[PDB]
């Protein structure tokens, strides 16, 4: 059944190198859903962060329609190994490092719906660059983004659009694996840009990270007040015993330096 349906699609002349046809010659519309699994290693020195997400792409390829109306056949067929299919050559413009997960079997899923609609799902681990602004360092908020766009195909061939309903989703155990920050807000936007090689469609998801304060309260503010307050208890020593005063003022000052370092 399924193996036969697949065989019927690739027994004819099908070229995975050729872009799927369109009714009006328009571009291939690729809907994108994105599921963040974990956001970790938020490096402030190199201004980058790691994040593991599930990319989900969906487009229409009439050539792959087998059931059409169906209603007698299976809704969709899982694409097995050894069958090539044209896919959006999407990449992450601000990715510095990327890994696909291939443990045991590669972590991918491709479905071919009867009408020719394709669902593509893949796990990807990224290390993205995220320029940060430390004006209010201790109590700051940073905004980190994942950009997504086609590399070779221009605006006449491929166009990205965020899924209409819940384009960005978070796994439940995301905030719990992110102890240092608090993921307050997310946004889903477009970043299409015009380059020297053409106009390329582009999506951009954005998370907003609010730095946890409890640490800096205990490891910076509290201890410094406690240090400054100590420098005051020398105002209560007789003016004759200056050694005591200096020892206090000097020690607290030195310690102040250390802590800051």
């Amino acid at each position: 059944s399924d193996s036969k349906i697949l065989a019927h699609l690739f027994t004819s002349g099908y070229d995975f190198r050729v872009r799927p046809p369109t009714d009006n010659g328009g571009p291939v519309v690729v809907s994108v859903n994105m599921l963040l699994r974990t956001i970790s290693k938020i490096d402030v020195v190199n201004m980058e962060y790691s994040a593991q997400l599930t990319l989900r792409e969906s487009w229409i390829d009439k050539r792959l329609s087998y059931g059409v109306k169906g209603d007698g056949q299976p809704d969709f067929v899982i694409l097995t190994v050894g069958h090539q299919i044209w896919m959006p050559d999407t990449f992450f413009p601000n990715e510095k490092q990327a890994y696909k997960h291939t443990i045991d079997k590669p972590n991918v899923l491709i479905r071919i719906h009867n009408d020719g609609t394709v669902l593509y799902s893949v796990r990807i681990s990224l290390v993205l660059s995220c320029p940060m602004y430390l004006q209010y360092y201790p109590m700051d908020v940073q905004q980190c983004s994942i950009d997504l766009a086609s590399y070779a195909y221009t605006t006449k061939d491929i166009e990205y659009l965020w899924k209409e309903h819940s384009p960005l989703q978070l796994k439940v155990g995301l905030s719990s694996s992110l102890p240092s920050f608090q993921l307050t807000n997310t946004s889903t936007t477009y970043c299409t840009s015009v380059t020297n090689t053409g106009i390329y469609s582009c999506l951009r998801t954005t998370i907003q990270l609010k730095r946890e304060f409890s640490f800096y309260l205990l490891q910076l503010y509290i201890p410094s007040c406690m240090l400054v307050i100590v420098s005051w208890v020398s105002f209560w020593f007789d003016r004759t015993a200056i050694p005591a005063r200096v020892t206090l003022g000097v020690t607290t000052l030195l310690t102040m330096t250390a802590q800051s370092a």
């Epitope: 328009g26 571009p27 519309v29 477009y190 015009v194 380059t195 020297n196 106009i199």
Partner: antibody
């Protein structure tokens, strides 16, 4: 307030080629890409092409491929447009319209120029 | 090739609600057409209204609003004003270039 002031009206003979300007002010010039629109008496509005100031990048309407040449001068915040092999059909009013998004292509029009009237006749 | 179609002209009174439409000849106006709406006041004064995904030009009054009523792009002025009397061009994006319409001459009756 932002403003796009274009060059004055021009009268040129067929075969020649002239260049109209569009001086931008009131905004970070290099952040918004520029469109060029041609309004002729004989037809509707036509989209000629667009240029990204920051990038130098250009994309033309297949129709005007070779007829128009979009350039940009960052120092003077000015966008230029060359028109080659001018003919009777090139007699029109050429507008320059800014794109809406900041350092990205949004595909929507902000402000236009007052327009430049080009008259081509021998 | 691809042609954009608009109402030759429309009429409305101050305060009423008028709707201009923009039709594609290749089919239904979808989101990848990025329907744009431009206003032309007398003496060649062009300004953008709506466009892109669902963004608007700076200063575009709240009464203006875009949508995809039926299978064509719409531009709805809720509570028309005297100054709203102008020529409205809509533009569709076909793959790699813009195509304008014939324009609609909206008249706010006086």
């Amino acid at each position: 307030e932002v403003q796009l002031q274009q060059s004055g009206p021009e009268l040129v003979r067929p075969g020649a080629s002239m260049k109209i300007s569009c001086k931008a002010s009131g905004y970070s010039f290099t952040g918004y890409t520029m469109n060029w629109v041609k309004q002729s008496h004989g037809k509707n509005l036509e989209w000629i092409g667009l240029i990204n100031p920051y990038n130098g990048g250009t994309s033309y309407n297949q129709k005007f491929k070779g007829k128009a040449t979009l350039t940009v001068d960052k120092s003077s915040s000015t966008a230029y447009m060359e028109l080659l092999s001018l003919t009777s059909e090139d007699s029109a009013v050429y507008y320059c319209a800014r794109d809406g998004d900041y350092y990205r292509y949004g595909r929507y029009f902000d402000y236009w120029g007052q327009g430049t009237t080009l008259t081509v006749s021998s | 090739q691809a042609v954009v179609t608009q109402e030759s002209a429309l009429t409305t009174s101050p305060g009423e609600t008028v709707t201009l439409t923009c039709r594609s000849s290749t089919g239904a106006v979808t989101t990848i057409n990025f329907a744009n709406w431009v206003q032309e006041k007398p003496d060649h004064l062009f300004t953008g209204l709506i466009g892109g995904i669902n963004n608007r030009a700076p200063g575009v009054p709240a009464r203006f609003s875009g949508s995809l009523i039926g299978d064509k792009a719409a531009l709805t002025i809720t509570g028309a004003q005297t100054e709203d009397e102008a020529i409205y061009f809509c533009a569709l994006w076909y793959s790699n270039h813009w195509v304008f319409g014939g324009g609609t001459k909206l008249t706010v009756l006086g």
